[PDB]
Amino acid sequence: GCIATGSFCTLSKGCCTKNCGWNFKCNPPNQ
Predict the structure, then answer these.
(1) What range defines the domain where residue 8 resides?
(2) What CA–CA distances, in Å, run from 26 to 5, 9, 30?
(3) Are the CB atoms for 12 and 20 separated by under 8 Å?
(4) Is 30 among the domain residues?
(5) Which terminus has fewer CB within 10 Å in the chain: N or C?
(6) Coil, strand or helix: which one is 13?
(7) Is residue 8 part of a domain?
(8) What is the 3-state secondary structure (H, E, C) of the chain?
(9) Nearest to residue 9, comparing CAs of 29, 30, 17?
């Protein structure tokens, strides 16, 4: 499982997109 994008992350790794913003939410690639 991963963290859904738009959800709070602790690490970008956890996010399906492998990208989490500085706002601590998983973001899409190239944003």
Answers:
(1) 1-25
(2) 4, 6, 12
(3) yes
(4) no
(5) N
(6) helix
(7) yes
(8) CCECECEECCCHHHECCCCECCCCEECCCCC
(9) 17
Look at the chain and report how many structural domains it folds into.
1
Q: What number of CA atoms fall less than 13 Å from residue 24's CA on the CB side? A: 3
Amino acid at 3: I
> What are the tokens at 9?
């992350």
Method: NMR
Sign of CA dihedral 13, 14, 19, 20: negative
Q: What are the Cα distances from residue 24, in Å, to 1, 11, 17? A: 18, 8, 13
Give a yes or no: residue 7 inside a domain.
yes
What are the tokens at 4? 């859904």
